[PDB]
Design a binder for this molecule. Structure first.
Ligand SMILES: [Mg+2]
Ligand SMILES: [Mg+2]
Ligand SMILES: [Mg+2]
Ligand SMILES: [Mg+2]
Ligand SMILES: [Mg+2]
Ligand SMILES: [Mg+2]
Ligand SMILES: [Mg+2]
Ligand SMILES: [Mg+2]
Ligand SMILES: [Mg+2]
Ligand SMILES: [Mg+2]
Ligand SMILES: [Mg+2]
Ligand SMILES: [Mg+2]
Ligand SMILES: [Mg+2]
Ligand SMILES: [Mg+2]
Ligand SMILES: [Mg+2]
Ligand SMILES: [Mg+2]
Ligand SMILES: [Mg+2]
Ligand SMILES: [Mg+2]
Ligand SMILES: [Mg+2]
Ligand SMILES: [Mg+2]
Ligand SMILES: [Mg+2]
Ligand SMILES: [Zn+2]
Lengths: 138, 208, 157, 226
RNA sequence: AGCCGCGGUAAUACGGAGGGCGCGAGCGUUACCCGGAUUCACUGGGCGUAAAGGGCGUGUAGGCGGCCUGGGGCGUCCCAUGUG
RNA sequence: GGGAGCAAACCGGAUUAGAUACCCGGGUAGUCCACGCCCUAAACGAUGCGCGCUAGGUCUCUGGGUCUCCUGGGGGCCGAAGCU
C-alpha cells in the first residue's frame, strides 16, 4: 500500500534529478505544496506549478540544476545534493527550538512543521517555536 | 624531582640549541656548537624517516625540556589551557611565562633556567613584596618580581644585573636595573616568544 | 616546486614458474599548505622508482581546496568502498586530529584545525581517495548561493 | 558563407539511423518514424549548426588547430580532401588510443618518420645491408599510412571534429580528459551530451558527410581570409 | 611474549655489556570499569554467495496509512510560574 | 488392498593387493491406491510481503485498440543512471 505522501515526493525529485529530467510531477497535497514553496524561496528548485495529469490533481515541479560542467562527465550538480526525511512515520521527530539543529554548518536547510506552519530552521528559530522535523536539503 | 643531568646533549637531542647551559651556551663551546649530532654509540650514523608520531613527540619534548619543567605537570598546564577560553597553542605558552622559574630567567636575574630556579627555591625572591620558594608560581599581570635585599650583594645576582645594560627585556616587562626590580606588564603573545617549537604539533601529541 | 609527504609503501606479489616476482607500490601526497594538494599511487619494479612515479600522478591529480581560516567550510561525509570517511571543521586551536592518513593529506593540503574519524574498512588506499573525494566536494558560502539562487544572480547580489 | 534547410535535405541529413540501434538521450532532435527508421528535425539542426559554426569561426579567427576524425570506410577520403583544403590535421586511417592522452609517446613516432624520409633521401641508406633496406623501407609507409594527417599536428589541437561520436567515442573520450572541446556529426545511435559543439545529421550518408565538411571547411578559410 | 612472532653457529626479540628512549619518589606487573568496538549499530549496521529471508499461505493481537473542510487540543511546539 | 518394471537391505559372479563398492545376474522393503500419521530438504531467485519513482533495446507467452503500430500482464537475455 502507499504509506508516506512526503518521503515519496523527495524520492521522485531525487530520482528525477539524478537523470537530469527538466520537470517532474507529484500527487497534489496541501503539505506538498507548502513544503514546495520553501524549496523555491530557497532556490533548490525553479518552482512548482499546479497541473492536472489525466483530470487528476497534481503538482508539476520544475528542476533546478548546476551549469554545464566539463571534464569527461559533463553532468552538473543538483542544487539538491541530498534531500531526505527525518520524521519517519511510526518513528517521529519533534524538536523544540533548543533541539532545532542546523544543517551543513549553516550552508543548508532543515524543514519544519510548527504551530505557524512550514518553516526553515532560520525562519524557525527566528520565530521561536518548533515541532515535527521533516527533511533536510543542500 | 626535576631532571638533573648532562644538559648540553639536548642542546643536541632534538637537533637545535636549547639555551639551557646558559652563558656558556653562547660560546664556541655549548655542546651543540661542536658536534650537532645527538647522543650515544650511533648519533653520527644515517637517520631514517621519523614516524608521524616521532615528530609528534620530538616537538613536544623540546618544549618540555626547553622550559625546564617535568612531564607530570607539563601536562596539567596543557590540560589547563584546553580548559580555558581561547586559542590553545597560545594560551599554553602564556602560562609558561607566568611560572616563577621563567619569570626570573627573562627578567634577567640569572644565567640559565636551571640556575634561575635555585634563586627562587632558596628564599632569594620578592613577589609583590614577599618571599617565594615556589617555581610552580602563577605570576599575574601587575605582579612585582624583584629580589629580597639580603641577597642583593651577591655576585651571581650582580654580574647578571650587570650585563642587562647591554640587553633589553621582553616587551611584556620593565627591568629596573638599579632598584633591582621587575614588572609583569601583560601576558605574552605568540607574536613575541620566538621559540624553536611548533606548538600545534605539540597539541597533536595531546590529541592522541 | 611542491612539498610532498609520503603515505605508504608496499610490496605486492605476482607469480610465475619457479619462485615469485614482484613490483612495489607507493602512496604519495603533495600540496602547498595554502589551498592545493594532490595524490598519486605508483607501481614500479624497484622501490624509489615508484615512489618517484607516484609523485608524478599527484601533480595531475590536483585538488584546489576551498580553505577558510585553515579549516573546513561546512561539515562532511563520504563513502568509497566500505571505508567511511568523516571530516568536520574544528576551531582555531584544535588542529589536525585525524588518524594516520587524513593527517598526511589534510596537513599538506593545508588545514590547521579539523575533526575526524575512520570507518569499517580502514585500508589506507580507500581512505586515501575516500578523502581526495571528500575534498573534491567541499562547497563554499558563495560557490553555493551561486549554485542555487544564481538562476538570477546579480539581481540578488 | 551561409546554409539553409533546403540544402541539408537533399543530402540526407534528416535521414537518421535505426530505432533498434538507438540512443534515448537523442530525444529532442527528431521528427518521427516514417518507416521505423527515424527522421531528424532539421529545424533543430539549424539550431545546433548556427552555434556550431560560430564556435568554428572563432577558432579560425584566433587561428585554432582542429583535428579531423573519420574512420568509417566511406568517411575517410572525404575527411581527407576536406581537411587538406582547410590546412589541417586529420585522423582518417585509424585512431590510436594515446594520440591525445599520450601525444608525446605517439609523437616520438612522427619524428621517427621525419627522420626516415630524410634517411631515404641521402645515399647512406643504400650502404646499410639490403635486408634492413627493404625491412626499414616497410616502416616508412606504415608511418605515412596512419599519420599523413598527424604530422602537421605539432602540439595539442583546440578542438576535435568527429563524424561518429560512438565509433571514436574513444577519441572523444581523450579530448574529454585533456579539456579539448569536441565537434561531432551524429545521427541517433550516439550519446549527445558527450559533445559541446554538435551536429545532428547523418553518420554514414556519403553526401551528408560531404556537404557538412565542405561547408565547415568554408567557414574556416573564409574566417581566415581567402 | 599483550598480537603476528624470534631461537635449528652472523639472533636490532632470549641472558649480559656499552650505548638509547620514556618516566621520576616513584616505575612496573596482575585484577576490574569505560573507550577503542558504527563488533548490540537511537545517533551509527546488515541477510543472493561472506554468520543471517522464516519451506509456502491465512489471519488475531499490535505497528502503520491516500485526497477535500470543519470541531476538539491527547500528543508536539511556545510563554509565564512552582519544583529540581 | 496392489506388486508389472525399478529397486536399499540381502544372495551370487567378476574386477582389485583387498572391493562390504564402480561393472553384471536375481532379490524383500518400497515406490502404486486408500485412509489416518510423519511435517524435514541445496523446500533455492540460496533474494519474506505490499505500494510509489528511475534510459532503453531485442526476444518470447497472453490479453484489448482507430491492429504499418499503440497500450495492459507474464516469462527470459543485453544494457542508462545508480548500487556493490
Ligand atoms: Mg610530585
Ligand atoms: Mg632559613
Ligand atoms: Mg557499505
Ligand atoms: Mg571491519
Ligand atoms: Mg650473536
Ligand atoms: Mg637483549
Ligand atoms: Mg556501542
Ligand atoms: Mg555489519
Ligand atoms: Mg549463507
Ligand atoms: Mg531457509
Ligand atoms: Mg492520517
Ligand atoms: Mg485536518
Ligand atoms: Mg496539548
Ligand atoms: Mg543389482
Ligand atoms: Mg506402506
Ligand atoms: Mg497417503
Ligand atoms: Mg510429508
Ligand atoms: Mg533440521
Ligand atoms: Mg522464500
Ligand atoms: Mg516484460
Ligand atoms: Mg555503470
Ligand atoms: Zn646548553
Amino acid at each position: 500500500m502507499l504509506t508516506d505522501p512526503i518521503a515519496d515526493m523527495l524520492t521522485r525529485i531525487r530520482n528525477a534529478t539524478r537523470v537530469y529530467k527538466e520537470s517532474t510531477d507529484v500527487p497534489a497535497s496541501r503539505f506538498k505544496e507548502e513544503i514546495l514553496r520553501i524549496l523555491a524561496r530557497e532556490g533548490f528548485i525553479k518552482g512548482y506549478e499546479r497541473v492536472d495529469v489525466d483530470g487528476k490533481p497534481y503538482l508539476r515541479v520544475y528542476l533546478k540544476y548546476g551549469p554545464r560542467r566539463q571534464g569527461p562527465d559533463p553532468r552538473p550538480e543538483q542544487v539538491i545534493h541530498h534531500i531526505r526525511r527525518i520524521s519517519k512515520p511510526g518513528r517521529r521527530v519533534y524538536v523544540g527550538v533548543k533541539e532545532i539543529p542546523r544543517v551543513r554548518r549553516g550552508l543548508g536547510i532543515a524543514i519544519l512543521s510548527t504551530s505557524k506552519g512550514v518553516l526553515t530552521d532560520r525562519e524557525a528559530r527566528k520565530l521561536g517555536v518548533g515541532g515535527e522535523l521533516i527533511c533536510e536539503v543542500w | 624531582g626535576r631532571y638533573i643531568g648532562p644538559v648540553c646533549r639536548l642542546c643536541r637531542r632534538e637537533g637545535v640549541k636549547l639555551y639551557l647551559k646558559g652563558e656558556r651556551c653562547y660560546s664556541p663551546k655549548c655542546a651543540m656548537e661542536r658536534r650537532p649530532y645527538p647522543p650515544g654509540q650511533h648519533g653520527q650514523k644515517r637517520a631514517r624517516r621519523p614516524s608521524d608520531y616521532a615528530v609528534r613527540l620530538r616537538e613536544k619534548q623540546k618544549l618540555r625540556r626547553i622550559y625546564g619543567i617535568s612531564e607530570r605537570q607539563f601536562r596539567n598546564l596543557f590540560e589547563e589551557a584546553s580548559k580555558k577560553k581561547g586559542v590553545t597553542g597560545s594560551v599554553f605558552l602564556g602560562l609558561l611565562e607566568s611560572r616563577l622559574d621563567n619569570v626570573v630567567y627573562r627578567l634577567g636575574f640569572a644565567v640559565s633556567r636551571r640556575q634561575a630556579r635555585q634563586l627562587v627555591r632558596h628564599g632569594h625572591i620578592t613577589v609583590n613584596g614577599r618571599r617565594v620558594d615556589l617555581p610552580s608560581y602563577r605570576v599575574r599581570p601587575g605582579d612585582e618580581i624583584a629580589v629580597a635585599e639580603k641577597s642583593r650583594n651577591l655576585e651571581l645576582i650582580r654580574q647578571n644585573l650587570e650585563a642587562m645594560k647591554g640587553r633589553k627585556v621582553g616587551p611584556w616587562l620593565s627591568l629596573d636595573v638599579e632598584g633591582m626590580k621587575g614588572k609583569f606588564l601583560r601576558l605574552p603573545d605568540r607574536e613575541d616568544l620566538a621559540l624553536p617549537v611548533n606548538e600545534q604539533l605539540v597539541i597533536e601529541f595531546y590529541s592522541r | 616546486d611542491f612539498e610532498e609527504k609520503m603515505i605508504l609503501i608496499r610490496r605486492t606479489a605476482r607469480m610465475q614458474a619457479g619462485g615469485r616476482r614482484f613490483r612495489f607500490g607507493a602512496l604519495v601526497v603533495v600540496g602547498d599548505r595554502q589551498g592545493r594538494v594532490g595524490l598519486g599511487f605508483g607501481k614500479a619494479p624497484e622501490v624509489p622508482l615508484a615512489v618517484q612515479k607516484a609523485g608524478y600522478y599527484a601533480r595531475r591529480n590536483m585538488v584546489e581546496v576551498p580553505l577558510q581560516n585553515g579549516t573546513i567550510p561546512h561539515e562532511i561525509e563520504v563513502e568509497f568502498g566500505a571505508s567511511k570517511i568523516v571530516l568536520k571543521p574544528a576551531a582555531p586551536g584544535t588542529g589536525v586530529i585525524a588518524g594516520a592518513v587524513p593527517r598526511a593529506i589534510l596537513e599538506l593540503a593545508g588545514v590547521t584545525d579539523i575533526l575526524t574519524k575512520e570507518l569499517g574498512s580502514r585500508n589506507p588506499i580507500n581512505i586515501a581517495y575516500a578523502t581526495m573525494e571528500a575534498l573534491r566536494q567541499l562547497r563554499t558560502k558563495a560557490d553555493v548561493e551561486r549554485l542555487r539562487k544564481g538562476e538570477a544572480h546579480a539581481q540578488a547580489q | 558563407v551561409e546554409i539553409t534547410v533546403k540544402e541539408l535535405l537533399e543530402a540526407g541529413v534528416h535521414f537518421g539511423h535505426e530505432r533498434k540501434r538507438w540512443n534515448p538521450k537523442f530525444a529532442r532532435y527528431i521528427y518521427a518514424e516514417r518507416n521505423g527508421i527515424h527522421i531528424i528535425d532539421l529545424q533543430k539542426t539549424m539550431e545546433e549548426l548556427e552555434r556550431t559554426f560560430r564556435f568554428i569561426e572563432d577558432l579560425a579567427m584566433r587561428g585554432g588547430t582542429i583535428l579531423f576524425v573519420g574512420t568509417k570506410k566511406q568517411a575517410q577520403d572525404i575527411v581527407r580532401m576536406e581537411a587538406e583544403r582547410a590546412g589541417m590535421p586529420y585522423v582518417n586511417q585509424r585512431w590510436l588510443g594515446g594520440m591525445l592522452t599520450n601525444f608525446k609517446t605517439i609523437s616520438q613516432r612522427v619524428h621517427r618518420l621525419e627522420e626516415l624520409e630524410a634517411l631515404f633521401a641521402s645515399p647512406e641508406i643504400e650502404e646499410r645491408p639490403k635486408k634492413e633496406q627493404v625491412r626499414l623501407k616497410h616502416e616508412l609507409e606504415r608511418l605515412q599510412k596512419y599519420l599523413s594527417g598527424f604530422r602537421l599536428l605539432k602540439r595539442l589541437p583546440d578542438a576535435i571534429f568527429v563524424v561518429d561520436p560512438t565509433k571514436e567515442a574513444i577519441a572523444v573520450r581523450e579530448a574529454r580528459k585533456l579539456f579539448i572541446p569536441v565537434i561531432a556529426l551524429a545521427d541517433t545511435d550516439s550519446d549527445p551530451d558527450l559533445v559541446d559543439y554538435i551536429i545532428p545529421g547523418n553518420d554514414d550518408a556519403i553526401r551528408s558527410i560531404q556537404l557538412i565538411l565542405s561547408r565547415a571547411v568554408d567557414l574556416i578559410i573564409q574566417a581566415r581570409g581567402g
